[PDB]
């Protein structure tokens, strides 16, 4: 401990929002809010970190998924400080189970960007330029960062398992391990390697992601 | 590498403005006669396409069967929807005593000695699903031992 407490890790949600399956992680209730037991936080953190370091040294890739508001930037920055892909803008329904069809769109993206890196755009009058451009910004808005995946990942990292329930389900279906920064209002059983902490509290997300990414770096 | 059996093709219709649009659904089993079974239901506008899709689903959906002496380790009763399947082990030299659908499923599993019965609803799709589920739910002496004592 001693790093988490100042980062606001152990602050959950109100008595209303809690998923009962999470009852084994709540220390106590204070001022109408649920507090997460820090001991088990540390223990599960150790377990997940051991997994991550072994996987990283083995050469596995982790797809970082934070599609909340305040999670976007942290996901982006932490992913950049690695070779790992990321999805932060929007999770398209079926990135994994339908990976084949998404790959076509990825190829279209790269070929279009090559077209703009070609002197052939002097054809296709300004209207055609406009259309293909609009397409390119749309693509780079969505399919950037997901680009690196030549194939299926070896793990997944989720900010809020309930917010990204679809991605969690997709990971489950394809027998891919699940890592998430779950909180009070999330189902423990769907997440293989769990970090019981905060999904709000930008400080907590920053700390967890930074530590994990640094561990990846030192183990690469 | 695998064998296919085509249980049924059906032509299901839907209304549109002054017309009927048809679609073909095919029920297909894929097996190796060694204890790997797949069941696939495939929908397509054309029969061969339905067959292809059903085969694909069957391949991407595999189940392992714990065969001893080409028979089941222990009897099972499974309900799916309104239909029930009853499977019961039999001594060698009995043969597969089953309806068309269960026989088709079980033959490709390597099963050669079994006594079966269908109860309640006898919809081929549901019977097939129930059969597959029952097969998914078989345990051996070793598995039980590991679960209990280990």
């Amino acid at each position: 401990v001693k790093e988490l407490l100042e980062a606001g890790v152990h602050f959950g949600h109100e008595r209303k929002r809690w998923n009962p399956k999470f009852a084994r992680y709540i220390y106590a209730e204070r001022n109408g809010i649920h507090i997460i037991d820090l001991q088990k936080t540390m223990e599960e953190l150790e377990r997940t970190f051991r997994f991550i370091e072994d996987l990283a040294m083995r050469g596995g890739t982790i797809l970082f998924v934070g599609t909340k508001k305040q999670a976007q930037d942290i996901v982006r920055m932490e992913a950049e400080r690695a070779g790992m892909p990321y999805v932060n803008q929007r999770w398209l329904g079926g990135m994994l189970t339908n990976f084949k069809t998404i790959s076509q769109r990825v190829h279209r993206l790269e070929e279009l960007e090559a077209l703009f890196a070609s002197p052939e755009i002097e054809e296709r009058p300004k209207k055609e330029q406009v259309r293909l451009k609009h397409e390119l910004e749309r693509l780079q808005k969505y399919l950037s960062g997901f680009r690196l995946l030549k194939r299926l990942p070896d793990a997944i990292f989720v900010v809020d398992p309930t917010k990204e329930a679809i991605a969690v389900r997709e990971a489950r279906k394809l027998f891919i391990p699940v890592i998430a920064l779950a909180d009070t209002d999330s189902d423990p059983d769907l997440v293989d390697y769990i970090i019981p902490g905060n999904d709000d509290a930008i400080r907590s997300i920053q700390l967890i992601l930074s530590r994990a990414v640094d561990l990846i770096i030192q183990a690469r | 590498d695998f064998e296919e059996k085509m249980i049924l093709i059906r032509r299901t219709a839907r209304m549109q403005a002054g017309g009927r649009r048809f679609r073909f659904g095919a029920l297909v089993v894929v097996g190796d006669r060694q204890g790997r079974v797949g069941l696939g239901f495939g929908k397509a506008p054309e029969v061969p396409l339905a067959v292809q899709k059903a085969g694909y689903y069957a391949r991407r959906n595999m189940v392992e069967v714990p065969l001893q002496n080409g028979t089941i380790p222990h009897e099972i009763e499974v309900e799916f929807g309104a239909s029930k399947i009853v499977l019961k082990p039999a001594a060698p030299g009995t043969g597969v005593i089953a309806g068309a659908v269960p026989r088709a499923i079980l033959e490709l599993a390597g099963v050669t000695d079994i006594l079966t019965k269908e109860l309640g609803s006898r919809n081929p799709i549901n019977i097939a699903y129930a059969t597959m589920e029952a097969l998914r739910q078989l345990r051996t002496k070793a598995d039980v031992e590991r679960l209990r004592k280990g």
């Binding site: 389900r169 489950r172 279906k173 027998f175 059983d189 769907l190 293989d192 | 380790p73 222990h74 009897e75 082990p89 345990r139 002496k141 039980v144 679960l147 209990r148 004592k149």
Partner: protein, 138 residues
């Protein structure tokens, strides 16, 4: 009025194991203790303990599960798939030695209340006695 205690106990075990509870409580009695020891021996449960709840004697039963499953629905494989009551009040089922059932080709067990105490089907066939058929478990 609680008509049948033994059925109640079996149902409590079943209901607990369905929601993957770690422990369950059942009102204590001698005969229930016998059934529980039989279950513990055959490794269906982690084991039972004699406890007290607000003055009343209870049995605390600790349940057993398999490893965490992979893929969708990671709920662990059950150790007690199925538990019935054979001879209910209102229809008592007694069996001789020759009529003792074989459950799941022996993978499961059947609990009997013989004159020599509470035995599994195997032990009852070995000794060579019959009695009231209590329950089947697998």
């Amino acid at each position: 009025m609680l008509t049948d205690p033994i059925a109640d106990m079996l149902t409590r075990i079943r209901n607990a194991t369905r929601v993957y509870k770690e422990s369950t409580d059942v009102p204590a009695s001698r005969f229930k203790e016998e059934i529980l020891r039989i279950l513990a021996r055959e490794g269906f449960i982690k084991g039972y303990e004699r406890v007290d709840v607000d003055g009343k004697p209870y049995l605390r039963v600790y349940l057993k599960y398999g490893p965490r499953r992979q893929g969708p629905d990671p709920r662990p494989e059950q150790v007690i798939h199925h538990i019935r009551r054979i001879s209910k009040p209102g229809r008592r089922v007694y069996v001789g030695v020759k009529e003792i059932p074989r459950v799941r080709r022996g993978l499961g067990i059947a609990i009997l209340s013989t004159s020599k105490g509470v035995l599994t089907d195997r032990e009852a066939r070995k000794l060579g006695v019959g009695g009231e058929l209590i329950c089947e478990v697998w």
